[PDB]
Structure formats: structure tokens, C-alpha cells
Scaffold this active site. Structure first.
Site, mmCIF file in Angstrom:
data_model
loop_
_atom_site.group_PDB
_atom_site.id
_atom_site.type_symbol
_atom_site.label_atom_id
_atom_site.label_comp_id
_atom_site.label_asym_id
_atom_site.label_seq_id
_atom_site.Cartn_x
_atom_site.Cartn_y
_atom_site.Cartn_z
ATOM 1 N N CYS A 11 1.120 -2.211 -6.054
ATOM 2 C CA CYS A 11 1.504 -2.451 -4.637
ATOM 3 C C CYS A 11 0.382 -2.797 -4.184
ATOM 4 O O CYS A 11 -0.324 -3.669 -4.711
ATOM 5 C CB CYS A 11 2.713 -1.396 -4.112
ATOM 6 S SG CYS A 11 1.649 0.338 -4.234
ATOM 7 N N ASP A 56 6.805 -1.818 3.152
ATOM 8 C CA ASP A 56 5.724 -1.072 2.782
ATOM 9 C C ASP A 56 5.784 0.279 3.279
ATOM 10 O O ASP A 56 6.456 0.456 4.615
ATOM 11 C CB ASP A 56 4.362 -1.743 3.474
ATOM 12 C CG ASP A 56 3.172 -1.112 3.266
ATOM 13 O OD1 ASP A 56 3.005 -0.654 1.979
ATOM 14 O OD2 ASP A 56 2.228 -1.321 3.916
ATOM 15 N N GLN A 108 3.962 8.047 -0.710
ATOM 16 C CA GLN A 108 3.137 8.144 0.633
ATOM 17 C C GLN A 108 3.934 8.507 1.827
ATOM 18 O O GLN A 108 3.448 8.731 2.792
ATOM 19 C CB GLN A 108 2.801 6.704 0.975
ATOM 20 C CG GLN A 108 1.283 6.316 0.300
ATOM 21 C CD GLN A 108 0.205 7.158 0.713
ATOM 22 O OE1 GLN A 108 -0.122 6.648 2.019
ATOM 23 N NE2 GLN A 108 -0.466 8.066 0.263
ATOM 24 N N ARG A 120 4.522 2.779 -3.270
ATOM 25 C CA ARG A 120 5.620 2.056 -4.079
ATOM 26 C C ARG A 120 5.237 2.319 -5.543
ATOM 27 O O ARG A 120 6.149 2.572 -6.122
ATOM 28 C CB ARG A 120 5.715 0.736 -3.450
ATOM 29 C CG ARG A 120 6.324 0.351 -1.919
ATOM 30 C CD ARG A 120 6.107 -0.742 -1.460
ATOM 31 N NE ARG A 120 4.678 -1.229 -1.037
ATOM 32 C CZ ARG A 120 4.479 -2.298 -0.418
ATOM 33 N NH1 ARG A 120 5.209 -3.253 -0.436
ATOM 34 N NH2 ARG A 120 3.206 -2.423 -0.126
ATOM 35 N N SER A 121 4.106 2.034 -5.973
ATOM 36 C CA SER A 121 3.675 2.147 -7.222
ATOM 37 C C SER A 121 4.177 3.978 -7.834
ATOM 38 O O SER A 121 4.623 4.266 -8.800
ATOM 39 C CB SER A 121 2.293 1.910 -7.745
ATOM 40 O OG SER A 121 2.142 0.694 -7.459
HETATM 41 C C1 LIG Z 1 -0.233 10.516 2.543
HETATM 42 O O1 LIG Z 1 -1.609 10.589 2.229
HETATM 43 C C2 LIG Z 1 -1.511 11.182 0.898
HETATM 44 O O2 LIG Z 1 -0.229 11.330 0.101
HETATM 45 C C3 LIG Z 1 -2.580 11.387 0.377
HETATM 46 C C4 LIG Z 1 -3.280 12.572 -0.307
HETATM 47 O O3 LIG Z 1 -2.631 13.684 -0.173
HETATM 48 C C5 LIG Z 1 -4.609 12.839 -0.884
HETATM 49 C C6 LIG Z 1 -5.467 11.305 -1.012
HETATM 50 C C7 LIG Z 1 -5.042 10.127 -0.284
HETATM 51 C C8 LIG Z 1 -3.686 10.219 0.324
HETATM 52 O O4 LIG Z 1 -3.272 8.842 0.665
HETATM 53 C C9 LIG Z 1 -4.214 8.132 1.166
HETATM 54 C C10 LIG Z 1 -3.565 7.255 2.420
HETATM 55 C C11 LIG Z 1 -3.229 8.016 3.677
HETATM 56 C C12 LIG Z 1 -2.520 7.175 4.691
HETATM 57 C C13 LIG Z 1 -3.583 6.298 5.602
HETATM 58 N N1 LIG Z 1 -4.231 5.096 4.931
HETATM 59 C C14 LIG Z 1 -3.790 4.184 4.948
HETATM 60 O O5 LIG Z 1 -2.551 3.649 5.412
HETATM 61 C C15 LIG Z 1 -4.765 3.096 3.996
HETATM 62 C C16 LIG Z 1 -4.081 3.078 2.599
HETATM 63 C C17 LIG Z 1 -2.855 2.677 2.245
HETATM 64 C C18 LIG Z 1 -2.127 3.894 1.693
HETATM 65 C C19 LIG Z 1 -0.720 3.307 1.332
HETATM 66 C C20 LIG Z 1 -0.428 2.061 1.409
HETATM 67 C C21 LIG Z 1 1.108 1.420 1.173
HETATM 68 C C22 LIG Z 1 2.193 2.358 1.155
HETATM 69 C C23 LIG Z 1 3.208 2.141 0.209
HETATM 70 O O6 LIG Z 1 4.601 2.552 0.373
HETATM 71 N N2 LIG Z 1 3.043 1.594 -0.830
HETATM 72 S S1 LIG Z 1 1.194 1.276 -0.881
HETATM 73 O O7 LIG Z 1 0.909 -0.447 -0.850
HETATM 74 O O8 LIG Z 1 0.244 2.297 -1.580
HETATM 75 C C24 LIG Z 1 -1.297 1.008 1.949
HETATM 76 CL CL1 LIG Z 1 -0.738 -0.747 2.195
HETATM 77 C C25 LIG Z 1 -2.604 1.388 2.464
HETATM 78 N N3 LIG Z 1 -6.082 3.115 4.470
HETATM 79 S S2 LIG Z 1 -6.717 2.484 5.892
HETATM 80 O O9 LIG Z 1 -5.714 1.493 6.528
HETATM 81 O O10 LIG Z 1 -8.256 2.309 5.719
HETATM 82 C C26 LIG Z 1 -6.583 3.913 7.003
HETATM 83 C C27 LIG Z 1 -7.574 5.219 7.011
HETATM 84 C C28 LIG Z 1 -7.460 6.515 7.749
HETATM 85 C C29 LIG Z 1 -6.345 6.302 8.745
HETATM 86 C C30 LIG Z 1 -5.314 5.308 8.743
HETATM 87 C C31 LIG Z 1 -5.522 4.198 7.880
#
Ligand SMILES: COC(=O)c1c(O)cccc1OCCCCCNC(=O)[C@H](Cc1ccc([C@@H]2CC(=O)NS2(=O)=O)c(Cl)c1)NS(=O)(=O)c1ccccc1
Ligand SMILES: [Mg+2]
Length: 299
Positions: free
Chosen positions: A215, A181, A262, A221-222
Site C-alpha cells: 500500500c 488511507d 493502523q 491496508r497491507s
Molecule cells: C499505529 O502505530 C502502530 O501500529 C505502530 C506500532 O505499534 C509499532 C511500530 C510502528 C507503528 O506504526 C508506524 C506509523 C505510526 C503512525 C504515524 N506515522 C505515519 O503516519 C507515517 C507512516 C505511515 C503509516 C501508515 C500509512 C498508511 C495507513 C494505511 O491505512 N495504510 S498505509 O499506506 O501503511 C502511511 Cl501512508 C504512512 N510516518 S510520518 O508521516 O514520517 C509520521 C511520523 C511521526 C508522527 C506522525 C507521522
């Protein structure tokens, strides 16, 4: 190769973070009003990962047509993918209903049900032939017909049946089990070996509905998997394959679902996957077997 020349200069500059954040700053933002409605809270795994209204997949049910899934339609590449979060205990029926309604042939899973002691996705498919699944709320039955377990990925043949009409369909399940992840595949070789296994199965044929990729959140990952696949598609389709700008392709994909890719290293990995993959696209009839040996799938 302009692509590898750019890769070369970014590595030298040490600017992957800045390149990545630039893409983030320039990314589209559209409303996700449906996903945010109160009655849909329990249908989303993460409050900050929602599908845009304009591209969300609608379930055909009159009750609630919501599912955290987006249709990513790449026009020039001529390929459509459905990216969705790992189903929740209460949205496994919805997930298969979407597979059925959209006529998908394959499901690509890039995560594990439990990663580092945390549940990341529900067990939405049967692990045992003799223990089939019934999604009551959906009128669908799912049976595991067989599975081919490799060292880092598994391919499964599932039979999805519409109990109402009794029509049955074979669905292929491509499960990458060792992609950490927020991380990257062990090597471009292992990634591409897997990707070409999905391609070769016919699951991505335009005759079928969109392949369903997920994912845990459906964006990290997706996003990497889809970004690499689309760029390779584009390199095989243009007169000048060196013209493919991965940063522009990602921005085009981000119009359909937020947060694709991500971390800055998942973006760098995508460059490597595409650069390594270009060789097959351009001729090399030995690279595929090389990727196979390198990935040690028969471990
Ligand atoms: C990096 O951010 C971006 O690229 C982005 C953007 O530009 C515009 C809109 C959304 C964006 O991401 C959203 C996620 C931003 C990162 C922070 N988000 C998360 O970790 C999670 C969401 C999240 C995001 C990504 C992953 C995984 C990462 C990966 O390599 N594959 S995946 O299974 O998609 C998982 Cl398993 C979970 N939300 S939370 O625990 O309720 C949470 C809320 C606020 C602060 C911390 C945690
Ligand atoms: Mg058994």
C-alpha cells in the site's frame, strides 16, 4: 461462532480502541539496523516504518541489498507474503528485482499513486502497452500486456523480462483502487470479492514465491489484507475453525513487520471480513456471487 461472539461483545463494550492498543502494547520489537543506515535513508518512504533485520528481503545485488520489504512467513497457515512500502522513484528497479529474485507471481496493490492530493507511491508499472519500462540499474524490462478494469479494482497482466537471460515471466497485478488511507474497504463483500480473485488466479500458490503486497507504507491496508487472508486459511485448516484468534494471528504477523493494522477500525473490519468469509470456507456456495453483486464491480 466464538469469533463473532467476541466481535459481538467488543461492539457492545465499545472497546475496539482498547483491544487495538493492547495488541500494540504487546507487539514485538526487533532491530532495524540496516534500514536505519545513512546510505539507506533515500530507500525508505517513511522514517518510522522500517523492516526488521531478521525478516527483511535482501536484494541479490552486491552493491546495496536493501529494500524496505519484509517476509511475513505464517507457519501454521502455510503461506508467505512479502509486505513492502509503495516504491519510490529511485527504488522501482529494486522492487522489480525483488519480484524477480523472489519468484513472485502476483503483486497486490491497495493504494493509489495519488491520494487526496499527495503522492503515496511511484508509478512503477507501465500504464500503456506501447510505453514499456526499463529499469537500467536492474537489467529488467516491464511491459503492460492487458488490463481488466472493474469499478473498484483492476487486474493487470504484465510481462517482466530479465534482459540478461531473456527469460520472461507473467506477473499479475491486483490493484484495489478505492481503499482510503487509514480507512477500510466499502464492505466486507467488496474486500472478499477482491481477495478471492487473487486466490483464484493461482498467484498465492506455494509453487510460486511469496505474493508481494503493498500500500503506501506497507503496514495499514497491507496488514488488513494479509491478516484476513491468513485467518481464513487457518479456519479452513483447523478441526475447530472457531479456534482462530485474530488478535493472536496479528501478533504473530507483527513479529515479521512492525505496525500491521493502523487503526482500531481496520482491526474491526478484519473481524468482519473473516466472519463473512468463513461462510464460503464452511460451505455456502452462493456467498461468492452475493459478494460480487454487493460490490457492484461491473459498475
Ligand atoms: C499505529 O502505530 C502502530 O501500529 C505502530 C506500532 O505499534 C509499532 C511500530 C510502528 C507503528 O506504526 C508506524 C506509523 C505510526 C503512525 C504515524 N506515522 C505515519 O503516519 C507515517 C507512516 C505511515 C503509516 C501508515 C500509512 C498508511 C495507513 C494505511 O491505512 N495504510 S498505509 O499506506 O501503511 C502511511 Cl501512508 C504512512 N510516518 S510520518 O508521516 O514520517 C509520521 C511520523 C511521526 C508522527 C506522525 C507521522
Ligand atoms: Mg492505448
Amino acid at each position: 461462532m466464538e469469533m463473532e461472539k467476541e466481535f459481538e461483545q467488543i461492539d457492545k463494550s465499545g472497546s475496539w480502541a482498547a483491544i487495538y492498543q493492547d495488541i500494540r502494547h504487546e507487539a514485538s520489537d526487533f532491530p532495524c539496523r540496516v534500514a536505519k543506515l545513512p546510505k539507506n535513508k533515500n530507500r525508505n518512504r517513511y522514517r518510522d516504518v522500517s523492516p526488521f533485520d531478521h525478516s527483511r528481503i535482501k536484494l541479490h545485488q552486491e552493491d546495496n541489498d536493501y529494500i524496505n520489504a519484509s517476509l511475513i512467513k505464517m507457519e501454521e497457515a502455510q503461506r508467505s507474503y512479502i509486505l513492502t512500502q509503495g516504491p519510490l522513484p529511485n527504488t522501482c528497479g529494486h522492487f522489480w528485482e525483488m519480484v524477480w529474485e523472489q519468484k513472485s507471481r502476483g503483486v497486490v496493490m491497495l493504494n493509489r499513486v495519488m491520494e487526496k492530493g499527495s503522492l503515496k507511491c511511484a508509478q512503477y508499472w507501465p500504464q500503456k502497452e506501447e510505453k514499456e519500462m526499463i529499469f537500467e540499474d536492474t537489467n529488467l524490462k516491464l511491459t503492460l500486456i492487458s488490463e481488466d478494469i472493474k469499478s473498484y479494482y483492476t487486474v493487470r497482466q504484465l510481462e517482466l523480462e530479465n534482459l540478461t537471460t531473456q527469460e520472461t515471466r507473467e506477473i499479475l497485478h491486483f490493484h484495489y483502487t478505492t481503499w482510503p488511507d487509514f480507512g477500510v474497504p466499502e464492505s466486507p463483500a467488496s474486500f472478499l470479492n477482491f481477495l478471492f480473485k487473487v486466490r483464484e488466479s493461482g498467484s498465492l500458490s506455494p509453487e510460486h514465491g511469496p505474493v508481494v503486497v503493498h500500500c503506501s507504507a506497507g503496514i495499514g491496508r497491507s496488514g488488513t489484507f494479509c491478516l484476513a487472508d491468513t485467518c481464513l486459511l487457518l479456519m479452513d485448516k483447523r478441526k475447530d475453525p472457531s479456534s482462530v484468534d485474530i488478535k493472536k494471528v496479528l501478533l504473530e504477523m507483527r513479529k515479521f513487520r512492525m505496525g500491521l493494522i493502523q487503526t482500531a477500525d481496520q482491526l474491526r473490519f478484519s473481524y468482519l471480513a473473516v466472519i463473512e468469509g468463513a461462510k464460503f470456507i464452511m460451505g455456502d456456495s452462493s456467498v461468492q456471487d452475493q459478494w460480487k453483486e454487493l460490490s457492484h464491480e461491473d459498475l
